[PDB]
Design a binder for these strands. Structure first.
Ligand code: SF4
Lengths: 1138, 261, 261, 261
DNA sequence: TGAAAAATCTAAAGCATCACC
DNA sequence: GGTGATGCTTTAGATTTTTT
């Protein structure tokens, strides 16, 4: 970018800063502030030299706002050979005069240096510039030639490798100066020549309320297409400012005026309104823009406004004589986002998508409103509102302002404290934090922690294409072992029905021999309470001995089961803390030998294995050499259109790797008859326990901080309850603010702790190790598998999860105990026995003993300790657990179950109400109804009879006709809505069904539905064109409400029939495919699990699959089989030898 | 050192394709009196008895008793190469773990020796007791194979009954049931395709036709086969082969549990 | 009490082999005139009529008009079990839900009686009147099946012409196309190979070639076929089955309604 | 007006079914001396050279060197789809991109013509050289097909070695290793069971069995197959299409350059 | 931001059938 | 009457999209 344009760019953003309540601080004085935004701009200094800087925007507690510019000269580090640092530094100084300003040698601790523990540091060279474009220029000048030279293994060749080129500028400032969003500051100024100084203030923490805005768009459209920015008109913008609502309405489309109306969904929520009616759209946009000018906000909020609101309004401002930049300040960036120089843009969809932990298909609105806010906003589909806007505007206004208030309170209650709790520890702007994924958040935390430890940052690694494992066999997958997610058995397990069990007396003898030790460990480690002052220890030991013996003497019982959730909370961070794994600590034997700590009898090594899965071509290395040599004298089509001929040597790595992979794949798919080979081998690697602990130290710090903030959140929550029991406005406000702050910090720490494990496996990460994820996942698999071996011995497990076990235990097996304790602070102690049992199992199995830490760096003395935070926390006895079954042998449904709370509500329900893709709206209401009504019953037969009876409703309605009940809601009872993003033309290669019904509807009304994208795709499947697959029998409902002669003609033409005279909608539909769908659902949910648990068919209208039918015939028959082992007497045993 | 030679190479192909489907790993017992097989299937429902006496082979010699374990599926897979006529020679060594198969052309043009490396295994070997069987019937292999493949399509249970007029093959299932009665052929010129029965006590006892179909594919071994049964004992199906030896299969019955009343 | 017998029972096996895939459910009709079947196929696009008169069975007894409840894919499994020279002796008692057919070996040594349970259904019956048709071709059955398989390999539809020079079988697909001419043969008097065509006027009409090749599998039951075809009339694919009955096929023509006109 | 009538159609169907799964699409060069096919396969390691001379055709008429680009799958399914005993004929237009075929039955009963489109492609005709080969062997097609399917069925690579005693085919694998040796005979006056050896210089080289199976799929084309190899020159699996043309094959040596261990 | 559920193409393997010595 | 061989059927595996 030319300076002769960026100078007026910076002048323009300075003007816009001046006209939105911000002012650059010029008077030398100290004033408090609150950082809310960073923006890398340009600041001309006092000596007419171009200088890049940052723009720290602040607000204050009184309403006044300002900003401060910090000029910090950017830099990166380069590393050169020993004995040549000063020469290359002087050569760069005398080669880029005017670009390079200051260069010096700086010692910093490389993290992968050989023999680095005793104090070796590699001398680095840091060069500083004035502007960011000079960084880009010198980087593009020096990087590619030198990285090719290094990977191959004039005086610029003496350098080897540079670091943190990819770090953005504002992140670099936020690291070097410790300037995080949502903190109070004392900014002091002296003059232009004197650099400005900033200090952090911590004696107060109370967050102010920035001026906030939240608007939503409702628009009409031509029927059944995606709305465009030129055919229809905006008619109602509804926006919220600090709990007060304003609505601006275009009077051309709506019918009459609008009056003020209260809109409160619940007494907690406030919906006041002062509506305003305007003549035309230009006056609406002018009034809205001027009202934004009047309010002058720093933060504002849209719900999916990046892709639906702002491009639309920007296009219409551009067409109707304005330009969107110079009046508000929002514009399109190269990355397709909408940032403002003065305002921060929030998108609630990104938060729901990334951190809300909702099901994937419930990411859109009304779902985060019924799940998080607690109420269902008033809705109507976009097809109806176009016609609704003509006659009455009450429903349209209600929907628009309901969307506005839902967006506003969804942001303010949850998203705002959460994101402004992340930004206290993340060194990025709030929109930067909310925009991109958890990977860069964790990367920024490791960035700041590595900078406090003075550690160089590794480059984002090159994604090495076509890697060779041992004897060639180039890979298309480099993966660790998948998670062990299964469902051991299917059916119902309620806490009232009797259930079968199979004890092992040896297991109960083992459990009996050590009850005292398990209670020792439970009292000493779980609560850090010394055991020598509890009084009723003998009584509870006698009680548990009596229960265990009375259950032992009959190792076969049918009693009521107690469902437990033996899971380990924060399991993967617990593993990485206990085993002390760091992504640059695990080192193979090829370098530990060069390490001087390779002494026999030491504990620098810990061995853990993992299952590496590798999928590759069967072509050997020689085949790869032949194919790369043969791919040397051929032409390729140009990458750009109308380009010249492209040879092989000048091709980029990506395209040549793709083409060579395609050539190998085509050579393989005809020659070696096996395209892919998946090979799993055990790999064992050494994890150095003697490392500069910043990673695991960070994880430990976040876990301790999370527990501390949970404690402070609980104590401030009981302060909140006392405060609402006394009722004074100031103190309830203060305690509410502090409680929300502590809760948001708690959730932020929990999210970061959950994302540490997910970060390291991600491609391109600075600290990349697939061995990390493999080792931690395999250790978790080992813990889970020993847990399920023990639960198999003592009871029965039900579901297999990455960090949880579900199980049923006999009711006579002990559950929990109460202890009398002489401690005045902790007089009552409760311990659940299965938790203690699993805890002592993992204590004797998985405790690290080589867990070593620094003591003092001067004498190199290392204190060896032993820690194990792996804890099976348990959940209460649930009322029921449901495992629906699959339809095929060998494959069992993974993470598809339902758990019920004690009171009869829903505890968990996963894998069913996700609606990941478009569904039929024919199985969701069925499964919801059966789960709701499923609880009533006494035995297995009674509960299956009840669920069969409630399923007979849907089976009778779908299998028979609609009958007496009205036909109004039947169309939406079966209709499935589908949509596509691109045009109809570029999808013409495939057939599918969506473009097929798009073409079917194109021949009805016109070709205008082809030139656009995203239309209605109703799927009422027809019957009478039999033999044709469903892809051709897809007709929409647009022809049902059309003209009668037109629909007669098109029903005769489309479905290749002419003689038939019945054109009713109650005959066109194919009841057989609908019954097949509902029956497949009922096989998944009810009938197959009923047949698995030794119970006959609950409903006789559904036919079992062939495998289950033949299993039931061979089982129910009194003729099972006989063997030969007992029918003939065994002779003996001998084995074949050499 | 072990040497064997068959004047007719078709019988080795036929025994390998007969024992291909039932088991996967076998254990040849090689003796100077003959070679035998007592391997056991993975389902533990059927056992294979094999006898091939020494005097059938053109050349046969054994220095001592040898026990080697071969992958029988791959054994039949490699033997399917050899033609229906070529001379098959077996060569083994007491200091080697590789069994050799030399094939000889009828008109002395081609030789084809193959090397198969064996493996160790742990299998059960079960002693078979000898008892007199109540009902004995011989039957041509073709029509018994047709009967078995016929009744396989009805259901999964076959009932073997011996009445005064002859043997009766029942089979029930979801498709109803179906019966096959056979009579006594006395005024027949040749007993190779004929049937004859002898009785001690009538008995009804059921078998599963999956393993019986597995036994069915030994039909080309010889045109005749004898099956016999008694109270709570398996069948003995003797596919005796041209005085080289015989081959037998044992299939578990089940006692008639009470279901009628 | 109803029963029947057939000296050459392979024709029943062959017609069930033909009908096992076109029809899944059909209600048999048993009358004093003989056996006849009237039903609609699975896709409801073609209705088949079968007729074997009383003289086809050497021993026929039918005292009342009664109808079976046979499903075809079930007893097609148990009718294919016979040999090509067996004897079929069907039997059915009036109050029984299940009919039993007894098999007889060609040289009379064994009996194989199988009974198949029936579900009672009710399907509407329609009587297509006889009409004189414009064209009737005396095409050999083998050549008709060959040309159907030939044309079905290119495209999904075929048009049939009967010009004054012969009949024209042409099909056009997305990949290729072509036309086949069958010239009249009068130099050879044998009807097994020569063709004679009834000539009234040329007719162009499109049929579902996929379904035509679907039910061309009935070929070996008759030596020659006759295609009776009229304008906007379903074609009558006649098979003179053995020497006593006929196999009536009616496939409804399809008409394309293109949007160009 | 490219016309090529040949009184037999079986040989063209066989030589076209030879290129079923080997070359998906190729260029059909027409010249006054006949038709040629030079084409690289999808994996770009083997070669095909088919020549059908003009004099071998019954009647032949060409006017100008014209090259087509029809894919092998479409024309192969078209030609194999029709009959085999009939008479083939070619028909083409000067500027059109469509070939035509004529199937005239020898008994003057029916005619059958199909015509299909093509795709335009003008890949360079590789100027392969002809060199004197180290050894030449002539053996019947049947036993060569047998041993190739053998060694693809038992292993992956074959070492073909030629000496004075004949030729050997040593194949190894994860299951074992064996070889097949053939000896020349001269007392047999017919070549249907006789093999011949040309001995100039012995050579050992390793090939792949998938390509050998793909080539020797063309076994009904000729009763004899001739092989020739050198130190680094590929094989020549030459075929003799009656007395009308020849179809060759080439395989680059399987270099392995393995570590010496 | 992806990546795996489901549909759809696709080739290998077994089976009854076809003509000949 | 057996037997090499082939069209037909089945069945497991490769492929491909989207969720806006
Ligand atoms: S594992 Fe031991 S030898 Fe290897 S780097 Fe660590 S301390 Fe040094």
């Amino acid at each position: 970018v030319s300076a002769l344009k960026r100078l007026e760019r910076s002048q323009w953003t300075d003007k816009m800063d001046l006209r939105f309540g911000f002012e650059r601080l010029k008077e030398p004085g100290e004033k408090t502030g609150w950082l809310i935004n960073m923006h890398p701009t340009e600041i001309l200094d006092e000596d007419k030299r171009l200088g890049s800087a940052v723009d720290y925007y602040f607000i204050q507690d009184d309403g006044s706002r300002f900003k401060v510019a910090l000029p910090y000269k950017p830099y990166f580090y380069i590393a050169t050979r020993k004995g040549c640092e000063r020469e290359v530094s002087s050569f760069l100084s005398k080669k880029f005069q005017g670009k390079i300003a200051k260069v010096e040698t700086v010692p910093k601790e490389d993290l992968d240096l050989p023999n680095h523990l005793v104090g070796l540091k590699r001398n680095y060279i840091r060069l500083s510039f004035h502007t960011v474009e000079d960084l880009v220029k010198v980087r593009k000048e020096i990087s590619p030639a030198v990285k090719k030279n290094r990977e191959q293994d004039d005086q610029l060749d003496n350098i080897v490798d540079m670091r943190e080129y990819d770090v953005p500028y504002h992140i670099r400032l936020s690291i070097d100066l410790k300037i995080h969003v949502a903190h109070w500051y004392n900014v002091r100024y002296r003059g232009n020549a004197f650099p400005v100084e900033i200090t952090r203030r911590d004696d107060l923490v109370e967050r102010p309320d920035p001026v906030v805005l939240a608007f939503a768009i409702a628009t009409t459209k031509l029927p059944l297409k995606f709305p465009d920015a030129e055919t229809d008109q905006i008619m109602m913008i509804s926006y919220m400012i600090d709990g007060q609502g304003y609505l601006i309405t275009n009077r051309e489309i709506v019918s009459e005026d609008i009056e003020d109306f209260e809109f409160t969904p619940k007494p907690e929520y406030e919906g006041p309104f002062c509506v305003f009616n305007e003549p035309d759209e230009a006056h609406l946009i002018q009034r809205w823009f001027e009202h934004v000018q009047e309010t002058k906000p720093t933060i504002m909020v849209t719900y999916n406004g990046d892709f639906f609101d702002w491009p639309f309004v920007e296009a219409r401002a551009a067409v109707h004589g304005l330009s969107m930049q110079q009046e508000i300040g929002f514009q399109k960036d190269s990355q397709g986002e909408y940032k403002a120089p003065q305002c921060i843009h929030m998108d609630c969809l990104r938060w729901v998508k990334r951190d809300s932990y909702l099901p994937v298909g419930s990411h859109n609105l009304k779902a985060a409103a019924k799940a998080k806010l607690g109420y269902d906003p008033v809705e109507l589909d976009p097809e109806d509102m176009c016609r609704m806007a003509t006659e009455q505007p009450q429903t349209l206004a209600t929907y628009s302002v309901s969307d506005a208030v839902a967006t506003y309170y969804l942001y303010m209650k949850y998203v705002h404290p959460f994101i402004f709790a992340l930004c206290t520890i993340i060194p990025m702007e709030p929109d930067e934090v909310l925009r991109k994924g958890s990977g860069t958040l964790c990367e920024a935390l490791l960035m700041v922690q590595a900078f406090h430890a003075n550690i160089i940052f590794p480059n984002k690694q090159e994604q090495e294409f076509n890697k060779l494992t041992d004897d060639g066999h180039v890979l298309d997958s480099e993966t660790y072992v998948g998670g062990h997610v299964e469902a051991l058995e299917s059916g119902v397990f309620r806490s009232d029905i009797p259930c079968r069990f199979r004890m092992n007396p040896a297991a109960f003898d083992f459990l009996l021999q050590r009850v005292e030790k398990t209670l020792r460990h439970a009292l000493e480690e779980e609560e850090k309470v010394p055991v020598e002052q509890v009084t009723n220890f003998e009584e509870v030991c006698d009680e548990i001995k009596s229960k265990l013996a009375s259950l032992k003497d009959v190792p076969s019982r049918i009693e009521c089961p107690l469902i437990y959730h033996l899971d380990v909370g924060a399991m993967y961070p617990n593993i990485i803390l206990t085993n002390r794994l760091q992504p640059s600590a695990m080192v193979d034997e090829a370098t530990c030998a060069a390490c001087d700590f390779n002494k026999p009898g030491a504990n620098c090594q810990r061995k853990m294995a993992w299952q590496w899965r590798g999928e590759f071509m069967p072509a050997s290395r020689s085949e790869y050499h032949r194919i790369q040599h043969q791919l040397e004298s051929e032409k390729f089509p140009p990458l750009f259109p109308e380009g010249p001929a492209r040879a092989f040597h000048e091709l980029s790595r990506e395209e040549q790797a793709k083409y060579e992979k395609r050539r190998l794949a085509d050579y393989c798919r005809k020659a070696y008859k096996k395209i892919h080979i998946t090979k799993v081998e055990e790999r064992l690697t050494t994890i150095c326990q003697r490392e500069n602990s910043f990673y695991v130290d960070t994880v430990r710090a976040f876990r301790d901080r999370r527990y501390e903030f949970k404690g402070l959140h609980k104590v401030w929550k009981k302060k909140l309850s006392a405060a609402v029991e006394v009722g004074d406005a100031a103190e309830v406000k203060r305690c509410k603010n502090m409680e929300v702050l502590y809760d948001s910090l708690q959730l932020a720490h929990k999210c970061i702790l959950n994302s540490f494990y997910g970060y390291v496996m991600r491609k391109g990460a600075r600290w990349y190790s697939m061995e990390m994820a493999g080792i931690v996942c395999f250790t978790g698999a080992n813990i889970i598998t020993q847990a399920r071996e023990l639960i198999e011995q003592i009871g029965r497990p039900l579901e297999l999860d990455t960090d949880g076990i579900w199980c049923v235990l006999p009711n006579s097996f002990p559950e929990n105990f109460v202890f009398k304790t002489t401690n005045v602070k902790k007089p009552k102690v409760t311990i659940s026995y299965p938790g203690a049992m699993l805890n002592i199992m993992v204590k004797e199995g998985f405790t690290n003993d080589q867990y070593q830490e620094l003591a003092e760096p001067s004498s190199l003395t290392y204190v060896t300790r032993s820690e194990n935070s792996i804890f099976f926390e348990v959940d209460g006895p649930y009322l029921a657990m449901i495992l629906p079954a699959s339809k095929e042998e060998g494959k069992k449904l993974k993470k598809r179950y339902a758990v019920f709370n004690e009171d009869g509500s829903l505890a968990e329900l996963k894998g069913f109400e996700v609606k990941r893709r478009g569904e039929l709206q024919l199985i969701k209401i069925f499964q919801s109804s059966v789960f709701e009504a499923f609880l009533k019953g006494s035995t297995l037969e009674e509960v299956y009879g009840s669920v069969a009876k409630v399923a007979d409703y849907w089976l009778d309605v779908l299998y028979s006709k609609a009958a007496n009940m009205p036909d109004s809601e039947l169309f939406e009872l079966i209709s499935e809505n589908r949509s596509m993003s691109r045009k109809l033309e570029d999808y013409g290669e495939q057939k599918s069904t969506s473009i097929s019904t798009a073409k079917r509807l194109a021949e009805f009304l016109g070709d205008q539905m082809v030139k656009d994208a995203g239309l209605s795709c109703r799927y009422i499947i027809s019957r009478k064109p039999e033999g044709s697959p469903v892809t051709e029998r897809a007709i929409p409902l647009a022809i049902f409400q059309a003209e009668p002669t037109v629909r007669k003609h098109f029903l005769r033409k489309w479905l290749k029939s002419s003689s038939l005279q019945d054109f009713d909608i109650r005959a066109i539909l194919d009841w057989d495919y609908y019954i097949e769908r509902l029956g497949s659902a009922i096989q998944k949910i009810i009938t197959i699990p009923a047949a698995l648990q030794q119970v006959k068919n609950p409903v006789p209208r559904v036919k079992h699959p062939d495998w289950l039918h033949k299993k039931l015939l061979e089982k129910n028959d009194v003729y099972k089989q006989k063997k030969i082992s007992e029918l003939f007497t065994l002779e003996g045993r001998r084995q074949v030898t050499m | 050192m072990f040497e064997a030679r068959l004047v007719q190479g078709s019988i080795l192909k036929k025994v390998l394709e007969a024992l291909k489907d039932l088991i996967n790993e076998a254990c040849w017992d090689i003796s100077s009196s003959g070679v035998n097989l007592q391997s056991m299937d993975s389902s533990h429902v059927s056992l294979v008895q094999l006898t091939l006496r020494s005097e059938g082979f053109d050349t046969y010699r054994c220095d001592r008793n040898l026990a080697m374990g071969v992958n029988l599926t791959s054994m039949s897979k490699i033997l399917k190469c050899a033609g229906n006529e070529d001379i098959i020679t077996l060569r083994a060594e007491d200091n080697a773990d590789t069994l050799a198969l030399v094939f000889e052309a009828p008109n002395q043009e081609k030789v084809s020796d193959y090397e198969m490396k064996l493996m160790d295994l742990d299998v059960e070997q079960l002693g078979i007791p000898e008892q007199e069987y109540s009902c004995v019937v011989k039957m041509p292999s073709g029509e018994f194979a047709r009967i078995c493949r016929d009744l396989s399509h009805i259901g999964d249970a076959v009932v073997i009954s011996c009445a005064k007029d002859g043997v009766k093959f029942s089979a029930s299932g979801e498709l109803g049931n179906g019966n096959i009665k056979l009579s006594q052929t006395s005024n027949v010129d040749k007993e190779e395709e004929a049937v004859t029965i002898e009785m001690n006590e009538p008995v009804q006892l059921t078998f599963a036709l999956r393993y019986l179909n597995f036994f069915t594919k030994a039909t080309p071994l010889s045109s005749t086969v004898t099956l016999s049964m008694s109270a709570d004992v398996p069948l003995v199906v003797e596919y005796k082969i041209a005085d080289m030896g015989h081959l037998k299969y044992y299939l578990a019955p089940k006692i008639e549990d009470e279901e009628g009343s």
